[PDB]
Design a protein around this ligand. Structure first.
Ligand code: YJD
Ligand code: YJD
Lengths: 223, 11, 223, 11
């Protein structure tokens, strides 16, 4: 599978966009947490289907398939969130019908810090002019880099080759190609940071009983 | 749990 | 000034090796935490000196200098530790007289998971045959990527350029130069995960009265 | 505090 062909399989694996669904009502710490957990649960169902559509992911051991999805889920969600918000300065596009402002994060205690992190990282992706095909590779790399091992090292290498190929297709200088690749992978650390913070907050909100004990979202949060 | 049903059970 | 000059000052700015010095006692939860906090506090004094020797770091706004050090300090301590442990599989080289086996992690509740993260990351750096000069660039990249914006983005780009130059110093292919750059930078996400878990654990130990938190270490942990 | 002293007091 050439890098173009692999990029195409990722384009085709793309999960469908989740619509939030709500009977109106304004924002309180419990209501916002409710909407976010409702969105994430539906998105996780589709994320498992997306991963399955990545060539070679089903060839990995069940242990490895479960390992990668359980470690990276919050990071994959926030990447999708960041990508949806790229053309919307100062806003977080959770769903077409759920657009949150920075100042709206003052609702839930602990959420503001995460909102700021995601907004800063989205602004960095905006600055870099992240392309849809770069987003496709970066997101799949997030899944695979949350670490048989030969099949995983191969699949991670193939997605990385595809990204390098995507950057070369822009016609930019070799020095600038290495710099863009480094600039995109340096932000992976920021995605992990926001994710670590998001997950710590989710445990906190459940400990405080702000939001109820979930189904597939709770499974991901636990093991 | 549910992830080992979705990952095992095909579509 | 260029990549060569940058690598030379990083080569000559390495912090002194911190020696523990403690009278004999078998490990308990409070004692291992006492040894680690004691070591980290001394190391943080030398880290501030090290950072001041990074070409152009003292030229950054004071806001950024303080911000970068306070955000990355754990990641830098763990990067240093992982480099000291590179050639000793299954062991953590905290100091010459403080060589921890993986199983010693069972003394402190929740430390084992952080020890395992650090050992798996060290084993990945060992697999990749991480070079001293790549380590110096990576450790400086950790400091600078932990966030005048132009000055900071320029300095970050100079370290990136220095790392690309070091990888170019081997006889490896263009595809292999990109892949190595990609394999090294994807590991930045792992160092962040380990630091976040490390901060969370330290905050827990501080709230569970296991250890009193030392002068500078308390200043770093607080902000 | 200490860091604003060490970062401005050189050496
Ligand atoms: C499980 C749930 C509460 O998840 C979240 N907690 C967050 C805290 C701050 C910002 C975004 C957050 N997401 C979140 C939800 C959906 C999504 O596509 C991306 C992120
Ligand atoms: C602040 C202090 C307690 O720091 C740590 N907490 C840890 C938990 C697990 C593993 C290593 C840890 N280090 C640590 C200590 C010294 C060092 O050079 C690198 C890491």
């Amino acid at each position: 599978l050439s890098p173009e062909q692999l990029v195409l399989t990722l384009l085709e694996a793309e999960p469908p966009h989740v619509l939030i669904s709500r009977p109106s009502a304004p924002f309180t710490e419990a209501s916002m947490m409710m909407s976010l957990t409702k969105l994430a649960d539906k998105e996780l169902v589709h994320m498992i289907s997306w991963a399955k559509k990545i060539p070679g992911f089903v060839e990995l051991s069940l242990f490895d398939q479960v390992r990668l999805l359980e470690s990276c889920w919050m990071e994959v969600l926030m990447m999708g969130l960041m990508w949806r918000s790229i053309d919307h300065p100062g806003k977080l596009i959770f769903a077409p019908d759920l657009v949150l402002d920075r100042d709206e994060g003052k609702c839930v205690e602990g959420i503001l810090e995460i909102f700021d992190m995601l907004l800063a990282t989205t602004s960095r992706f905006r600055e870099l002019k992240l392309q849809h095909k770069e987003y496709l590779c970066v997101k799949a790399m997030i899944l695979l880099n949350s670490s048989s091992s030969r099949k995983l090292a191969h699949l991670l290498n193939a997605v990385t080759d595809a990204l390098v190929w995507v950057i070369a297709k822009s016609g930019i200088s070799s020095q600038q190609q290495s710099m863009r690749l480094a600039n995109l992978l340096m932000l992976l650390s920021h995605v992990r940071h926001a994710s670590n913070k998001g997950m710590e907050h989710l445990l906190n909100m459940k400990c405080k009983n702000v939001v109820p004990v979930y189904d597939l979202l709770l499974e991901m949060l636990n093991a | 749990h549910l992830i080992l049903h979705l990952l095992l059970q095909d579509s």
